[model samples]
Target: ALQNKEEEKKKVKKLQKSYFDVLGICCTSEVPIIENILKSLDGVKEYSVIVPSRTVIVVHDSLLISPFQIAKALNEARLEANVRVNGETSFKNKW
Candidate 1:
């Protein structure tokens, strides 16, 4: 039974997911601001903000946190936000 227990420990795996945001941060300082905001989250294992693309990549353990919660927190940080999935338009263009 001890051997089985040890095997279970080794087989343990944690499921995780990542959330990506393409923020239109017009100002240069917004990059660091976004990074700092994401880094403050508990389950955020890694985060990066690309200056050129104005994209934020956040990897976190979903078991401990929700993507929506993170996004809400980000919204509170005063940055414009738009959610994207697969290949959809986050912004609307009116003619």
Candidate 2:
């Protein structure tokens, strides 16, 4: 057994927030998968998704993440995102 096992987890609320308006993920089923993808990224302090509203709220460490990074993450999950005014930027892949 180890001696000093008194480590603690941070309980402070996240200070930074970025909102993304997502398209093509308007279904409720997509929320879970989208949330999972967001959780994979570092600095994701917290997140909320509104399926019908097509919105994603992310609380994060700005030092490590921005809405840009969040959008990138969303794309990986098949979510097209736009930033500003609650999400308006799209990183669509065109042929």
Candidate 3:
């Protein structure tokens, strides 16, 4: 039982170490449109859009948030945007 538990812990830690990219979006009109799109995306853990800064912070599973998809979503949502993979940054690590 203990061995199994240890193995599970290792698996979880490994999964946690895996990094995902962040998509920064700039919305012109309604931010909710972008928010809704991000919410619809699979594996998106969480996100926030700062209207004042014209930035959207997206934290998602590495396997899910792709550059192409992010760009496509932004375009479809009619938001001028840029997407970049956030390096070694975790939402938990940040305030």
Candidate 4:
């Protein structure tokens, strides 16, 4: 059992944690749309879409899917991602 467990752990791939500032998330109704989009994508180990804050957290294998590619997919769905905040209050201004 110990040997089997060790082998299992070895098969696990390191995942990349990506943070994205998203746009076009104005309400909760868009949650399902985002879920479906990420669910169908490959190499995405996990995803979290914070609707209120308009943020996205993705755990993926960079070897298979890059952060830029993920952002591109979201952009195709009309939800812009990978926005950078220049200052602390910069993002707050829009809110």
Candidate 5:
């Protein structure tokens, strides 16, 4: 039991945390829509939107969900978005 628990911790530790700074979030209603969409995406853990700044910070497990996919989803929803500075570099990290 101890070994199994230790392994579980190791697995959790290995999952990467990615920050995706998004742009073009313009309205309050859009926040809910974006939140729902990300919640539906596998490995998308959380998202925080700062409306005034036109910024949304997002974190996801890159193995199952790419930031590019997230951006594409937003565009499909009629919500324009693009990744933040240094966000694309996340793809280079080991998935």
Candidate 6:
């Protein structure tokens, strides 16, 4: 605990990150489902729901969860969210 406090004076560690192009989701109300799904994963640390972009950015422990695993979990929940490797797109049709 004391040793950890000393390192706080300088820097921090890094974690895994991924962006998901969430389909059929364009509002905050739809975000809870995504949050819940992420919570189901063991190493997921945090997530940001960018509603305007219809995207979700997730930070996790890669050793415990890969980006593909994140997308697979959402797909399994019928969310159809895919990981964005190049940071490019999202579905635009209103339903």
The numbered model that scores best in lDDT is 6
Give the RMSD in angstroms, all C-alphas superposed, for model 3.
10.6
Q: How many backbone clashes does every candidate have?
A: 0, 4, 0, 0, 0, 0
Residues 1-95, candidate 4: write the lDDT tens digits.
35565654633647766787777677888888887888878998878778766677778888888888888888898876773556466645766
Residues 16-77, model 6: lDDT tens digits: 67778878575588778878888988898888888886778888988998998888988887
Write candidate 5's Cα lDDT for 2-94 as tens digits.
Answer: 556554353456445444455555668777777888887788776787787767767677788777888777777766676656535565676
- The TM-scores of all predictions, comma-separated, are 0.63, 0.67, 0.53, 0.69, 0.62, 0.69
For model 4 the local lDDT of residue 21 reads 77
How many angstroms is residue 59 displaced in model 3 relative to the true structure, after the best TM-score fit?
0.2
- Candidate 5 weakest ten by summed lDDT: 10-19
> What is the alpha-carbon lDDT for the whole of candidate 6?
0.78
Q: What lDDT, from 0 to 1, does candidate 3 have? A: 0.56
- Is candidate 1 or 3 superior in TM-score? 1
Minimum summed lDDT over a 10-residue window in model 4 is located at 1-10
Better model by lDDT, 3 or 5?
5
Give residue 94's lDDT in candidate 6 (0 to 100). 42
Per-residue error (Å), model 1, residue 73: 1.3
**Model 1 lDDT on a 0 to 1 scale:** 0.67
After TM-score superposition, what is the CA distance of residue 68 in candidate 6 from its true location, in Å? Answer: 1.3
RMSD of 5: 10.1
Model 3: per-residue Cα lDDT over 1-95, one tens digit each:
34565644533432112221323444445566767887777776666767665456665556655645655776675555555444476868765
What local lDDT score does residue 73 receive in model 6, on the 0 to 100 scale? 86
Clashing pairs in 2: 21-87, 82-88, 82-89, 83-89
lDDT of 2 by residue, 1-95 (tens): 57442453234445567678787676587678888888889988778888767667778888897778888877776767877653335679534
Off by over 4 Å in 2: 1-14, 85-95
Candidate 5, which segments miss by more than 4 Å at Cα?
1-24, 85-95
Off by over 4 Å in 1: 1-15, 22-24, 85-94
